[PDB]
A paper describes a structure:
The [name] Npro (N-terminal protease) is the very first protein to be synthesized, releasing itself from the nascent polypeptide chain via a single, autoproteolytic cleavage event (Wiskerchen et al., 1991). Detached Npro is proteolytically inactive but acts as a viral immediate effector to modulate the host cell’s antiviral defenses (Ruggli et al., 2003). The overall structure revealed two compacted folding units: a protease domain (orange) and an interaction domain (I-domain, green).
Here, we present crystal structures of Δ(2–21)Npro from a BVDV-3/HoBi-like strain to 1.25 Å resolution, revealing a two-domain structure. We determined 1.25 Å and 1.5 Å crystal structures for solubly expressed and in-vitro-folded Npro, respectively. In neither case could we observe zinc binding at the TRASH motif but disulfide bridging between Cys112 and Cys134. The mixed disulfide of the third cysteine 138 with the reducing agent 1-thioglycerol present in the protein buffer indicated oxidizing conditions during crystal growth. Individual C112A, C134A, C138A, as well as D136N mutations in the TRASH motif abolished its zinc coordination and partially interrupted IRF3/IRF7 interactions in the Npro homologs Alfort and BVDV-1 (Fiebach et al., 2011; Ruggli et al., 2009; Szymanski et al., 2009). These findings corroborate our modeling studies, indicating that TRASH disulfides are reversible and able to adopt a zinc binding conformation without major alterations. The unexpected disulfide may point to such a function in Npro that awaits further investigation.
Numbering used by the authors: 21 to 168
């Protein structure tokens, strides 16, 4: 299974892996002052990193199926998309581009939210033209999509 990470960047099982350098998650980076759920209309901005915003502290953007979005999160998170829980799908009708995530395969993916609420990834680079939807989340944890 792809590992989860605690708020201090330590792996909770398995072995640590580096993020892809082109991901929008840039580590090491603190997080977890508070769990802060936000709606798709109130995603955080870069300029919210040091001050937080009116909603709370900000460490970046986290997502899990539902969809549920967060601007900070304290529990276990993915640093890479757990592709064993995704499924190849056609490209959906996109509502928002939300970042560039490292797959559990080490590759770079563009991440999107679809009009159906699904979270979708598409290979950014070589091997590109692979598109998958996040269909299972058996450990009920988000991906850290962007850090601020
Ligand atoms: Cl997994």
């Amino acid at each position: 299974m792809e590992p989860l990470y605690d708020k201090n960047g330590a792996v909770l099982f398995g072995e640590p892996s580096d993020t892809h350098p082109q991901s929008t998650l840039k580590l090491p980076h603190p997080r977890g002052e508070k769990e802060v759920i936000v709606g798709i209309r109130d995603l955080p901005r870069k300029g919210d990193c040091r001050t937080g915003n009116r909603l709370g502290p900000v460490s970046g953007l986290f997502v899990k199926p539902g969809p549920v979005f967060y601007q900070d999160y304290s529990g276990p998170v993915y640093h890479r998309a757990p592709l064993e829980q995704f499924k190849q799908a056609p490209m959906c009708e996109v509502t928002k581009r939300i970042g560039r995530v490292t797959g559990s395969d080490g590759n770079l993916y563009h991440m999107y939210v679809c009009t159906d609420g699904c979270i979708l990834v598409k290979t950014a680079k070589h091997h590109h033209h692979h598109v998958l939807k996040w269909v299972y989340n058996v450990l009920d944890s988000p991906i850290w999509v962007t850090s601020c």
